[PDB]
Design a protein around this ligand. Structure first.
Ligand code: 2QW
Ligand code: 2QW
Ligand code: ZN
Ligand code: ZN
Lengths: 955, 959
């Protein structure tokens, strides 16, 4: 009651938003946002502490992150560490947390009926945490797992490297994650009791005055107010001043510097950075957004367009980048072609020529107005967010914007401040640059090493003569400001729900050329539509060469349409175009208004587009590198890849694709395109703000454009062949072994093939998967410490299914095999032993997950598209399958496990892929395992086995 | 010495390569004999040819000679049983058949070499004391009616009889030789005619020893064979019947300068040009008709065909002499017609006369005669060993026309060049003596006559005198030239010594990404020949219907372009075959090894550097369209077999999908297809014959190098070498696919009981069951029940899978044939339970002998090896291994197998039936009881059927 310092005024929201909001500040300094949503299926809450890794002690790197893991381990009210995670698990809930440089964000979701119980357990960690000593070692191992994961990742390596080259005394040089060495090895050597320093950091930093709470529930604003005051007013206020970092981590000696970096993957990238003051305070005018929009533009006359025309770069990212409170960066990042790598100096001069063109032309009010207008449309028609992510996001935002501006924060622009644009543009000068080149061409030509990741690099000062050349850049006529964006939507009319509107997609067209599935949106009522097209051709995957040609065609087509499509993308109209094992896939999403205009341009271009020889050669080289770069992918990813090659009727390997790539000539590709488009079948899903007639009109326009320009004729029904899954023999065990040449970790996929999909088979497998899910994580990951990646669940491909296990470990694959088999026995035991009440809780947990309602149109369309791409067309699956699930007995699951999964099962169909670590050589009692049949040749393996039938559709 | 022998002939001229021994003699009763002693023979044979046929038929019974042929072999005084001869042959791995022509009735059998005396004794009784069992009368009439009814839907039998009906009706050549129900039952009953008494009248008047010729082939010596033939044939009654002669041509002045316009069954366009000629038989040592047929029928450069093709009128031509009877013959020039050719019949004929006049102007050529004589000498010397049954039948006929000493050289050796005789024959090839027939559907409803024996519709017109005058005054055409020296005539007949490392079966001598090469140097026949088989694999040959059409057109255009050049090689005993498959292309080169690499090189070069002539492309495309439509006029059982292959194979394009995609085949599309097809290949080859390992490797390298150079061929990935799988039928399932034949008023059916994947055991279970049921299936379904003209049973093998099949063509509905087959299977289940171990072991022994039967020519050996290669099983020693397993089999093992896989109540019964309805069809009696049959699942959509079933694995290779 007097526990409230102030209640905010109206929380500005979209007129389309039916959720109710209340902003307030508690007497202890906690900033609060309450969200009342009577329709919500899940309730949520988040707390964001404005303290992170930048506040870590110099002697303990990763302490803030360690505290994040340690904070949620029992309280005075709820002593058991498992209490919070167990309560959420029992009430269809989840939780997670993240530590950044200036924040530690904690969040959960729970069933709408259990918000008070979940929130009470959550609030206790900010009142009386116990920090349970029992879990210390495991958490250190969980922080060490997260770091060891990122070590071989090129992006994280680059992230730490930038921190290592600036002012060494600056908190920005800190290693924020931590690992075993920083949280255990070094403090033990140095005589640091980690527990007392953790407790000390918590006492010094965890103050209510630096905390922000967001709560979303079914309950009214008043009921939510009372509950938050009840649970959060007791949080201790220590009046901790908010840490600021006003000195830029890059001083005069850190400027006009050049870095030459060796990557893990075969990538060529150029990173251009300028230190800038913190622009956060200027958010109402956002001059960095204005400059990022122009420098990062991809339309005609853009910086990117000229760099592409010159054959130096393929992609560009430009704009402002966060630092911390007090410092920021302005970046211009490009990828490089082979020629671009030899013209780094010319690329930079071109970047400065474009910057100087912005100075010469001066700020543009019309550009600012367009950005403001698009942001207003984006805010008004924003998709409804999933509660968990929505509370977490707002909890962070509460620290930067007044209560009333919490939702409009990242959207609304108000005043045009040309002076501020000019101020920022004055910093984008050669005397203020930092340049980094990432290339394998630097291997063995570097003298320095970054300590955290092992990144090899060289530092050089940029010559004064190079700086002078950049300063004296002659004006380039190729650079022009963008023109008026003609894709800005204006028609937001929501068409009335038709008399014959359906709850699921209906087949409205069934011809030799096309199958058309349509549903007018009856849930979201936003002026948007999703238009999905699957184009089928036997010539898209007939051999590796054709598969390569299908890929290059679509990449060149997207490259050619880029300048035009970018304006549409800025205006909330996006598309995706990709090749498949059956043909092509096209998706058009966003505002329905200019949607037929973009679709028409894509179909026309598909059928009559010009191939630029220079682009062809550049895209072909990039595709070759992309294929090789798969060697640097994670061992578990490799395991999953080999199993797909093994189990599918036709599948071309990365090696067969790269070998056939050299035979792709420009004349061969020019003949391929009319061949591919000559005969097609189109299957579509048109879902959103559209009528039945408008849907038919869109499909007809796609057909007519292809018929006109490509002389498209339909395929015969006998030509519409889908690939089958390999039928494994009863009691058989096959193993396929390979080695990852990059990572020193093992990868494994174990697949227990069951049978063809059916209502019963799906539910037996899904309920077994539900039951084993939590124990698999608790046993294999938590207890046994097998590895970071421990996964179990149903595997579905080509109408067939089974149980799979995916594990990435430092331990050999043969050992992971015995541990999984050991676990299956423990699970057989666990089902025999479990109470009917515990069993019925598994049925209910599964039923809730299956009936989980899409919060946005794309999530609904994706569910319908899944039914279409599998040719099962079971749109009412969730209801029918849940109804069957509820009839299932504990005995039914025991019977199923005994026939299909048990080590001694008569119908056990086991296939394992073993991916060895780089250096690798070629507890519950584990059962006796048979000798596996080692697969030497994938072709002979497939030839020697039958192929399953394909699933009968739902008519 | 022996009084029963009138005379013994001198040396029977044979090839120096022929190890068989021959003896010619004439018996005292007038029987001309040839005895063949072959100690090597697996089967013994004998034939008797009576120099009396259909031309001697009485006007009261048309088909009486033919009816006698069927009635003679039904009971004897020594062997009273009606089926005694048939049973004896069936029990001793034998067979028999007979034919009646205009001037001959030829009877023949084959039997296991150990049972010649027993088979021959039963055979000889029919010429000593025949009975003609009154009980088999109606069943023989129905057999003759079946034969004719079958010929009724055949366009060639229609033409043959229409030719007989447009000559002098008073001439015996106009007679209907076959007979039918009407001439054998309907008519004699209405007229009070005694068919049996007229049958005996004819036999007693014509069947005389003085008009008979006997040939006997066996392992026995010439002396043992002499005694046996004298013993069995000297008692044949001599009635001194004079040999009928027909010296007046059935084509008299009023039958000349006549034009016929005929309606065919299939959509075919043909032109037939006929000239009456005197009987040239007596001139066999010079054979002027052969000389003239060789030039008029020539396909090389400057030929009549070449010009007719260039003009776009015809695709193919047949020219030469045609048999008539003793006293008359015909000279023919037959062509097929394009759409334009049909409108230029008058111009085609003028061109035929221009070529004929060019032969008159140039006069006979001694060098042409010498080439024909030289090729015939090579052909006679290196001839493959003939099957005994066909060899005895042929000689029995030949004995009536040539002296005993010339019976083998008869149809081979030319001696004297008689330019006067060539000139004499060429004088008859004139417009005033011409008969012209046009066959086209364009005449449908525009005809006024009907040939009553066949129902053929036609129109007759006299050719205008003005048209005859134009043909007589034909201006000389320079496009017509005589052929040049045939450079393909083989000269090198060296048999290369058998290499130290020569193998009994083909060995893999090359295993690369581009080619698998199987090689075997011949170690059996020692003739200067070799068979070169190439299978070219490409995923682009059958990817879709359009590509399948393009693969077909490419190869047809390629054979058309290479025709002029290949014809000279074909004349010189060097032939080739080039055809598209569901996996790519198939090329086979056979004959004399000498100029073999030269022809192969030209084919590969042409394949890779092919320039398509637009005019040919359009002509060949139209002919392919008609060929696809023409399948509707194919027999109902052929349709049934076709639908089952479509149903059971993973990928298969229908005739309808092929014809629909044909209109999209443009010239630029075909020109892009060829480099695409040849860009990536895998070659699998079998080179077998008179060749060494090095020569084999040199041939393969030359094929590879030619493709690599001209087509830039690269190998296919091993994962791209995919073979099609067979559909895996569910346990206890029965599927039926039903269609209708719009042309024939007969039903067609194929029943397939799918068993399992091929293996040593599975193959032998199925093969032994097939062995046991074979003869009973024919005797029950065909002979007793009278189901149809076509009754077949045996193992069905496709894509590594197998089963039992039944193929039947009947006038009865397919669901009735179904019940009868199922009743038969029960009778067979019974028969195996009942049979003695001795009878069972006789089945094992009969199968083992058939499986171990040695190939008798190189092509038969290569075909066996090629079967192992095309199936990718490579089990060249299969026969020995499989026979060894077969001998271990028990009667119980077969009962178990039948009970699990084939029985109506079997737990693993996989039945699939194709039912092809007749044109006008709509869908106790002391007979075997048909079981209760389930309701079949009717296949409506072939695609849905395949999608809903699993696919079998592919068979693991031996090598
Ligand atoms: C997803 Se890639 C699109 C590449 C496009 N060429 C580009 O540069 N776009 C700008 C952009 O995302 N820049 C950005 C984002 C994050 C950071 C850390 C820094 C810069 C925007 C232009 C519209 C106004 C806002 C920015
Ligand atoms: C088999 Se298709 C080859 C068609 C070739 N264009 C051609 O006419 N060749 C002549 C031929 O078969 N004519 C023939 C055969 C049978 C009868 C009843 C009538 C004529 C022969 C040429 C060598 C000398 C002997 C004949
Ligand atoms: Zn963490
Ligand atoms: Zn007959």
């Amino acid at each position: 009651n007097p526990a409230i310092k102030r209640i905010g005024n109206h929380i500005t929201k979209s007129p389309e938003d039916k959720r109710e909001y209340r902003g307030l500040e508690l007497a202890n300094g906690i900033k609060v946002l309450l969200i009342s949503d009577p329709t919500t299926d899940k309730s949520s809450a988040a707390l964001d502490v404005h303290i992170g890794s930048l506040s870590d002690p110099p002697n303990i790197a990763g302490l803030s992150h360690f505290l994040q893991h340690m904070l949620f381990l029992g309280t005075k009210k709820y002593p058991k560490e498992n209490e919070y995670s167990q309560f959420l698990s029992e009430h269809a809930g989840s939780s997670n947390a993240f530590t950044s440089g200036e924040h530690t964000n904690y969040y959960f979701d729970v069933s709408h009926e259990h918000l008070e119980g979940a929130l009470d357990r959550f609030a206790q960690f900010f009142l009386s945490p116990l920090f349970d000593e029992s879990a210390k070692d495991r958490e250190v191992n969980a922080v060490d797992s997260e770091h060891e994961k990122n070590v071989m990742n090129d992006a994280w390596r680059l992230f730490q490297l930038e921190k290592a080259t600036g002012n060494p005394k600056h908190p920005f040089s800190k290693f924020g994650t931590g690992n075993k060495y920083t949280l255990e090895t070094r403090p033990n050597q140095e005589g640091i009791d980690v527990r007392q320093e953790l407790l000390k950091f918590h006492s010094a930093y965890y103050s209510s005055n630096l905390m922000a709470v967001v709560v979303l529930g079914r309950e009214s604003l008043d009921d939510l107010t009372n509950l938050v005051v009840k649970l959060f007013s007791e949080v201790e206020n220590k009046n901790v001043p908010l840490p600021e970092f006003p000195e830029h981590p890059f001083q005069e000696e850190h400027l006009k510097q050049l870095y030459k970096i060796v990557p893990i993957k075969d990538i060529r990238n150029l990173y251009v950075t300028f230190p800038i003051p913190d622009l956060q305070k200027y958010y109402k005018s956002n001059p960095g957004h204005y400059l990022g929009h122009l420098i990062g533009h991809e339309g005609p006359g853009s910086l990117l367009s000229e760099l592409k025309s010159k054959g130096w770069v393929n992609t560009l990212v430009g704009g402002q980048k966060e630092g911390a409170r007090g410092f920021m960066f302005f970046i211009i990042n490009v990828d490089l072609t082979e020629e671009g790598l030899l013209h780094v100096e010319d690329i930079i001069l071109h970047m400065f020529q474009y910057i100087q063109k912005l100075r010469a032309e001066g700020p543009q009010e019309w550009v600012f107005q367009e950005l403001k207008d698009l942001n207003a449309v984006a805010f008004r028609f924003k998709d409804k967010e999933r509660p968990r992510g929505y509370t977490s996001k707002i909890a962070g935002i509460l620290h930067y914007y007044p209560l009333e501006e919490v939702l409009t924060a990242e959207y609304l622009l108000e005043e045009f401040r040309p002076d501020l644009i000019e101020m920022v543009l004055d910093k984008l000068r050669p005397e203020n640059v930092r340049v980094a080149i990432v290339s394998k061409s630097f291997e063995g030509k570097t003298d320095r090493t970054e300590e955290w990741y092992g990144t090899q690099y060289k530092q050089e000062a940029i010559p004064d003569e190079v700086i002078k050349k950049w300063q004296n850049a002659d004006l380039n006529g190729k650079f022009k400001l963008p023109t008026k964006n003609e894709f800005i939507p204006t028609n937001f009319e929501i068409l009335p729900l038709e008399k014959e509107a359906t709850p699921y997609p209906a087949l409205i067209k069934d011809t030799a050329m096309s199958k058309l599935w349509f549903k007018q949106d009856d849930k979201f009522f936003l002026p948007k539509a999703n238009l999905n097209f699957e184009f089928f051709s036997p010539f898209a995957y007939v051999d590796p060469l054709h598969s390569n040609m299908a890929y290059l065609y679509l990449e060149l087509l997207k490259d050619s349409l880029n300048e035009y499509a970018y304006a549409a993308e800025l205006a909330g109209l996006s598309y995706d175009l990709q090749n498949t094992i059956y043909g092509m896939y096209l998706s058009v999403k966003g505002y329905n208004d200019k949607q037929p205009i973009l679709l028409k341009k894509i179909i026309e271009k598909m059928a009559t587009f010009e191939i630029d020889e220079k682009r062809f050669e550049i895209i072909k080289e990039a595709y070759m590198r992309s294929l090789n770069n798969f060697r640097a992918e994670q061992p578990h990813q490799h395991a999953m890849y080999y199993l797909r090659l093994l189990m599918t009727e036709v599948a071309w390997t990365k090696d067969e694709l790269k070998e056939a790539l050299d035979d792709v000539t420009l004349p061969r590709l020019k003949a391929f395109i009319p061949q591919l488009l000559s005969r097609l079948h189109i299957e579509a899903l048109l879902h959103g703000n559209i009528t039945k007639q408008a849907a038919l009109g869109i499909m007809q326009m796609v057909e007519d454009t292809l018929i006109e320009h490509a002389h498209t004729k339909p395929l015969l029904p006998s030509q519409l062949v889908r690939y089958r899954e390999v039928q494994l023999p009863d009691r058989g065990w096959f193993v396929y072994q390979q080695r990852n040449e990059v990572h020193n970790n093992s990868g494994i996929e174990i697949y227990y093939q069951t049978d063809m999909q059916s209502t019963s088979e799906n539910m037996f497998l899904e309920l077994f998967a539900q039951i084993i899910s939590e124990p698999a994580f608790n046993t294999l990951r938590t207890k046994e410490q097998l590895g970071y990646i421990v996964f179990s669940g149903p595997r579905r491909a080509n109408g067939i299914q089974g149980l799979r296990f995916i594990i990435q470990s430092e331990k050999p694959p043969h050992y992971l095999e015995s541990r999984v088999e050991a676990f299956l026995i423990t699970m057989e035991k666990s089902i025999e032993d479990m109470t009917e009440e515990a069993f019925q809780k598994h049925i209910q947990a599964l039923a809730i997950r299956r009936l989980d309602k899409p919060k946005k149109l794309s999530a609904e369309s994706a569910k319908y598209w899944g039914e279409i791409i599998s040719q099962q067309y079971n749109f009412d699956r969730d209801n029918t399958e849940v109804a069957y699930l509820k009839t299932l007995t504990k005995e039914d699951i025991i019977k199923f496990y005994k026939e299909m999964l048990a080590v001694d099962a008569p119908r056990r169909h086991k296939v394992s892929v073993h991916v060895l670590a780089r250096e690798m050589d070629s507890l519950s009692q584990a059962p006796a395992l048979p000798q596996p049949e080692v697969i030497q040749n994938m072709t002979e393996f497939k030839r020697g086995l039958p192929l399953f039938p394909l699933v009968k559709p739902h008519i």
